[PDB]
Design an enzyme around this catalytic site. Structure first.
Site, PDB file in Angstrom:
ATOM      1  CD  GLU A 135     -33.235  -9.188  -9.854  1.00 31.07           C
ATOM      2  OE1 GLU A 135     -34.304  -9.500 -10.419  1.00 31.07           O
ATOM      3  OE2 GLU A 135     -32.114  -9.522 -10.293  1.00 31.07           O
ATOM      4  CG  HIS A 166     -22.767 -14.267 -22.806  1.00 33.88           C
ATOM      5  ND1 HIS A 166     -21.851 -14.037 -21.801  1.00 33.88           N
ATOM      6  CD2 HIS A 166     -23.912 -13.658 -22.417  1.00 33.88           C
ATOM      7  CE1 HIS A 166     -22.417 -13.317 -20.848  1.00 33.88           C
ATOM      8  NE2 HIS A 166     -23.667 -13.074 -21.198  1.00 33.88           N
TER       9      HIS A 166
END
Lengths: 97, 595
Positions: B357, B487
């Site tokens: 991150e 997805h």
């Protein structure tokens, strides 16, 4: 040139739209010149008659928020301009006694 | 005034309000994720509606600037991005139908439940039960039953809507000057108007196929080793020469093979390198982890974190007082307001996730100099590649000994290296052929080569040919298996993982050439190296103002993608796999379970 941070003074919740800046103009400004014209900038050959194609508003608002980064915080800038015209110097610095 | 000046004026007038509305939408999303309340939901919905209306109006008004009279690439790319109307170009009825189909598929995928045959009222949900059964259970009946139930839930009751969704997406792509939805997704890879850096959609497919063919021996050896290891754990179930069943792959869809590490570890007699116990004994917290990560990112030459980051990021779980979602994702509100939402704890996985991150945030700050229409990486895989290479550089034993988590007298043997390489192969390489097969199948479906009644048959044929997964239960054409993917059902790409893997391997091969390092490639550490940091920052600050080929060549010195770094990385593991499979059968037979 004097400038200082004013994040705790000029910021406001939901954006402080009280400050604006000019980003478009027909030509560059001369030094020590002031202009507050609000005419729509004509970016093309067509005559400007309102908001639309080739007609954008030259003034944009900042919208200062307290959660912005250091580069987007409001900074009050004061520039001291000194004049040396042929006249008695009425302004002087402090003198210690 | 030429067309270029008018386009630049329009972009300068538009980017301000664009960034303003984007910051508003990001703040609404942050308030929704940190506190799930009705007011926050309504505010987020209103912000999203306003953002969609603004994008539609800007795409409608941006059609007055022609692309043939633009000589600047930075302006031309932004004009091309603005001219793309997206889904707003279709009619009202078609848009409403597409939105209804998307919402129905999302509700079907989210409400997936598995009930027992003896008790219809006793049911379970995906995350706590199904993943635990597919990952931490050794029963042949329960895992197969759960897999069959999950495959029967999403299926024939979704294909009549999925076909209409595909038709609507094809119509939308044809409305946006594209041949099909596959070319619309591959439009980001195509580059034109650059001397010596052009790229075509077919060249990407050719490169992916070449990389797959070059990886084929390594993946074949890995699959043979996994089969030989699982043959002893499940007698009379794992075929010695046939394909492996789907329910014994350790995943609901066979994507990741990390769950099989507990049964396929070669040297399980010794624990793996883990700094969790060290952080527990030293009584560290998330603040210390983030400070160490910041010091690591500064030591390589990157700028430090901003004050608003530490003053606005929720790096600690607030508890029951706020309905925060513990989902670590990168947040970029814009205008210097970078935040991170993650419930970090004292674990090595959370350490790597926090490093990922922070790498994403550093990338966002790097390409922040570009306008809002270019505030993005060179491709959809650069961010994840940078995060993964940063996590790998932080996970090095030298960095762990420098930060004080490992003792200075710690040593490493070849067995730990082999275990780490096998884990990395099961985590990253295990999903590459599945990704390739899924992407090729979806591209062929979009092209219309498989019109009506050969979807599941050819799907399973290609699956057994590439991945080597045998059907544990007879299926038919109604059971649309690819529709159950996350997805596919939510309209997300899948080849992006392969692209980010390639970019990660290329960056690992490139950056480790400048920094001083001795030994294997997995021990490379770029800490305290300003040269590699500057070489990486020269590319991270490019954004979308330059093609991805030039940005990749400025790092790896190659004009096209390459896979030899992966082979050089896994050679120590490839040799051990060859030595283990020297006395075992290699390959897999596609003839099994003659149903």
């Amino acid at each position: 040139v004097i400038a200082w941070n004013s994040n705790k003074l000029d910021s406001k919740h939901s954006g402080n739209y009280d400050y604006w800046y000019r980003s478009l103009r027909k030509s560059k400004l001369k030094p020590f010149e002031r202009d507050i014209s609000t005419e729509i900038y004509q970016a093309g050959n067509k005559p400007c008659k309102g908001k639309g194609p080739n007609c954008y508003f030259p003034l944009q608002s900042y919208g200062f928020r307290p959660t912005y980064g250091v580069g987007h915080q409001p900074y009050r800038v004061v520039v001291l301009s000194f004049e040396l015209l042929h006249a008695p110097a009425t302004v002087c610095g402090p003198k210690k006694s | 005034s030429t067309i270029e000046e008018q386009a630049k004026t329009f972009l300068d007038k538009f980017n301000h309000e664009a960034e303003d509305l984007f910051y508003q939408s990001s703040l609404a999303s942050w308030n929704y994720n940190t506190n799930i309340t009705e007011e926050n939901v309504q505010n987020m919905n209103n912000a999203g509606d306003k953002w969609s209306a603004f994008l539609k109006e800007q795409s409608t008004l941006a059609q007055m600037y022609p692309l043939q009279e633009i000589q600047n690439l930075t302006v031309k790319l932004q004009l091309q991005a603005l001219q793309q109307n997206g889904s707003s170009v279709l009619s009202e009825d078609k848009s409403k139908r597409l939105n209804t189909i998307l919402n129905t598929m999302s509700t079907i995928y989210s409400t997936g439940k598995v009930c027992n045959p003896d008790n219809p009222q006793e049911c379970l949900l995906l995350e706590p039960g199904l993943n635990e059964i597919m990952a931490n259970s050794l029963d042949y009946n329960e895992r197969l039953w759960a897999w069959e139930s999950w495959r029967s839930e999403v299926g024939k009751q979704l294909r009549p809507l999925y076909e209409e969704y595909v038709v609507l997406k094809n119509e939308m792509a044809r409305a946006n000057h594209y041949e099909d939805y596959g070319d619309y997704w591959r439009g980001d890879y195509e580059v034109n108007g650059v001397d010596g850096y052009d790229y075509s959609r077919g060249q990407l497919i050719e490169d992916v196929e070449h990389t797959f063919e070059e990886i084929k021996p390594l993946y074949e050896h890995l699959h043979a080793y996994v089969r030989a290891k699982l043959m002893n754990a499940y007698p009379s179930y794992i075929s010695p020469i046939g394909c492996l069943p789907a329910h014994l792959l350790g995943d609901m869809w066979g994507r990741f093979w990390t769950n099989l590490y507990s049964l396929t570890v070669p040297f399980g007699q010794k624990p793996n390198i883990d700094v969790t116990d060290a952080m527990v004994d030293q009584a560290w917290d998330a603040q210390r982890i983030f400070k160490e990560a910041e010091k690591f990112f500064v030591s390589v030459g990157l700028p430090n974190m901003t004050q608003g980051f530490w003053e606005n990021s929720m790096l600690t779980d607030p508890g029951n007082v706020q309905k925060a979602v513990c989902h670590p994702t990168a947040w970029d509100l814009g205008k210097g307001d970078f935040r991170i939402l993650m419930c970090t704890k004292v674990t090595m996985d959370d350490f790597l996730t926090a490093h990922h991150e922070m790498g994403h945030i550093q990338y966002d700050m790097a390409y922040a100099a570009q306008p809002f229409l270019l505030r993005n990486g060179a491709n959809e895989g650069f961010h994840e590649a940078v995060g993964e290479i940063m996590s790998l550089s932080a996970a090095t034993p030298k960095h762990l000994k420098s930060i004080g988590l490992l003792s200075p007298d710690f040593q490493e043997d070849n067995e730990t290296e082999i275990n780490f390489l096998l884990k990395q192969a099961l985590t990253i390489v295990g999903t590459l052929p599945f990704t390739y097969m899924l992407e090729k199948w979806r591209w062929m479906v979009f092209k219309g080569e498989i019109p009506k009644d050969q979807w599941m048959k050819k799907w399973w044929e290609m699956k057994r040919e590439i991945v080597g997964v045998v059907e544990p239960v007879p299926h038919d054409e109604t059971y649309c298996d690819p529709a159950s993917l996350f997805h596919v059902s939510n309209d997300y790409s899948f080849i992006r993982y392969y692209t980010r893997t390639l970019y990660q391997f290329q960056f690992q091969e490139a950056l480790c050439q400048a920094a001083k390092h001795e030994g294997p490639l997995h021990k490379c550490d770029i800490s305290n190296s300003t040269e590699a940091g500057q070489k990486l920052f020269n590319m991270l600050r490019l954004g979308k103002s330059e093609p991805w080929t030039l940005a990749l060549e400025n790092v790896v010195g190659a004009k096209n993608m390459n896979v030899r770094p992966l082979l050089n990385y896994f050679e120590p593991l490839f040799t051990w796999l060859k030595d283990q499979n020297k006395n075992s059968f290699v390959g897999w037979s596609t003839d099994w379970s003659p149903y």
